[PDB]
From TrEMBL:
Record keywords: Lipoprotein, Secreted, Signal
A cellular component term, taken from the record's GO annotations: extracellular region
Family assignment from sequence similarity: Belongs to the 30 kDa lipoprotein family.
Record-given protein name: 30K protein 2
């Protein structure tokens, strides 16, 4: 069976979401010393923005096979599933995600992309994952505040929702799924809110200080990694 067919039979199981199966074929391939099949499948998923590549990294993660994720996927999947201190870097603008100091009403702390601050402990986040409905989701916890990223209910008139940090994961509002993308050679993520299915972005209106408010965005993002997606970087 040429690596042709193997790749496509690994890519298949992944996109119709047969995660159990993709795991097996990936263990075999791996044992059979054909890792380059796995790598290449993965880079193909990430190219084609296949959300299902998060779920295949997660099942490898829980199915004995951590070595496959650290081995054969871009370093981010390790940063994510290993729960490391990371920062969330917006491609468009290059600002790092953070939380305001004071609390905005019952809605929590305001999430923005801070204008100056790229190394302070305030820009530290972890990913914390679950499995529901044959899909992986993340809690996004600011390190300094022990508060989760969340999307508030009220919209502006575009239908955009505001992002804050709250003390609990109460609702589907505080849970996120990711979609991988390339832009050049960087690996990026569109980060959607489970409840509204809107993409985490930074505002186009810019505050005098340099910060941009972060929003759950009501419109298309796909095809514009450089404008929309995020960089996971070790804190």
């Amino acid at each position: 069976v040429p690596n042709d067919i193997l790749e496509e039979q690994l890519y298949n199981s992944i996109v119709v979401a047969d995660y159990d199966s993709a795991v097996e074929k990936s263990k075999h391939l791996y044992e059979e010393k054909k890792s380059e099949v796995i790598t290449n499948v993965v880079n193909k998923l990430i190219r084609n923005n296949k959300m299902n590549c998060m779920e295949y990294a997660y099942q490898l993660w829980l199915q004995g096979s951590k070595d496959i994720v650290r081995d054969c996927f871009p370093v981010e999947f390790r940063l994510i599933f290993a729960e490391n201190a990371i920062k969330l870097m917006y491609k468009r603008d290059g600002l790092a995600l953070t939380l305001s100091n004071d609390v905005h009403g019952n809605d929590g702390r305001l999430a923005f992309g801070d204008g100056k601050d790229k190394t302070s402990p305030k820009v530290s986040w972890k990913f914390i994952a679950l499995w529901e409905n044959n899909k992986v989701y993340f809690k996004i916890l600011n390190t300094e505040r022990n508060q989760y990223l969340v999307l508030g209910v009220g919209t502006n008139p575009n239908g955009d929702h505001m992002a804050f940090g709250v003390n609990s994961v109460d609702s589907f509002r505080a849970q996120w799924y990711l979609q991988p993308a390339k832009y050049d050679k960087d690996n990026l993520f569109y980060i959607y809110n489970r409840e509204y299915s809107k993409a985490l972005t930074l505002s186009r209106t810019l505050e005098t200080s340099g910060n941009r408010m972060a929003w759950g965005y009501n419109g298309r993002v796909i095809g514009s990694p450089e404008h929309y997606a995020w960089g996971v970087k070790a804190f």
